Amino acid sequence: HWGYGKHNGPEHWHKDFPIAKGERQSPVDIDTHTAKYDPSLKPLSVSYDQATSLRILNNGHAFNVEFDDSQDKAVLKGGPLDGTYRLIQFHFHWGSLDGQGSEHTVDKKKYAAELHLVHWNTKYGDFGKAVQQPDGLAVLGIFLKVGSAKPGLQKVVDVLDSIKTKGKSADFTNFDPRGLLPESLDYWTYPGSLTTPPLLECVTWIVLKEPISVSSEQVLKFRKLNFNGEGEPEELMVDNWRPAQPLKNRQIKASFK
Ligand SMILES: NC(=O)[C@H](CCC(=O)O)N1C(=O)c2cccc(NCCOCCOCCNC(=O)c3ccc(S(N)(=O)=O)cc3)c2C1=O
Ligand SMILES: [Zn+2]
Secondary structure, eight states: OOOSSTTTSHHHHTTTOGGGGSSSOSOOEEOTTTOEEOTTOOOOEEEOTTOOEEEEEEOSSOEEEEEOOSSSSSEEESTTOOSOEEEEEEEEEEOSSTTOOOSSEETTBOOSEEEEEEEEEGGGSSHHHHTTSTTSEEEEEEEEEESSOOHHHHHHHHHGGGSOSTTOEEEOOSOOGGGGOOSOOOEEEEEEOOSSTTOOSOEEEEEESSOEEEOHHHHHHHHTOBSSOTTSOOOBOOOOOOOOOOOOSOOOEESOO
C-alpha cells in the first residue's frame, strides 16, 4: 500500500488519494517573512492536566501514543479554534540524518523531526465524524532539533524496543504529554490536511515557533524502528515525512509579532 519508498511514496499517493493534489494540503513551508500577525487570535489553551494515555503502537508508518478521548481529559482550545478539541493521539516524523525529518519547514529549513499532537472537534461527536468536516481536526506541530535530551521524551524512547515492527503495541499508561512542549506557545496557523493518506483536508494546523531539543541518542532510537512486520525484510523506519506542498490560496497567520 502507501509508504515512503521510491515506489509507494508521496509522489504516488495521488493515484489512490486524489485529494493529494487538493487546495489545502499539508505540510507547507512557513515563510516567516510573509506570515501575518493576527491580533484577533484568541490565546491558546493547552489543557493536558487529566490526559489519559493508553498505548503505544507501531503502525508501519510511524508510532502512535493513543489517549482516552471519551471525555475532555486533554483538550486544545483558543487560538484560531472555535470549540473544544480532544487529544486522541500523538506521533512523530523523522529523518535518516539530523538535517531532515520534519514535515513543515521554516524558511525552507528542515528539522530533525516533528511531533504531531492530534485533536478532534468535540462538536462532531467522534473522530470519524470529525474527519468529514472542514474544521474537524486540530494538529499541534512541534519541531525537534538535536541537542540536549528532552526528559519528557525519554519514557517514549524507553518503550520503543517493545514495538520494533509493524503491528506491535505495548501498554503506555500515565504518560504526561506536557513534558513534550517547548517553553513558548507562540505559533503559526493555517488550514490544511492530514500529511498521510487519506490526506483529508480537515486540519487547523498550529505549528509552534520554538522547537524542542532532543539528544542524538533519542532520535537514533527513533531510527532503529522498523516499517516492516516481524518476519518480513527489515526496512528501517526513517524519512517518514511528506515534503512541503504548494500554499495556493492560503495565508499563514502568526500569534506573535
Ligand atoms: N484510536 C483510534 O482507533 C483512531 C484514532 C485516529 C488516529 O489513530 O489517528 N480512530 C478512531 O478512534 C475512530 C473512530 C471512528 C472512525 C475512525 N476512522 C477510521 C477510518 O476513518 C478514516 C480516518 O482515519 C485516518 C487515520 N489517520 C489519522 O487519524 C491521522 C491523523 C493525523 C495525521 S498528521 N501526520 O497530519 O498529523 C495523519 C493521519 C476512527 C480512527 O481512526
Ligand atoms: Zn503526522
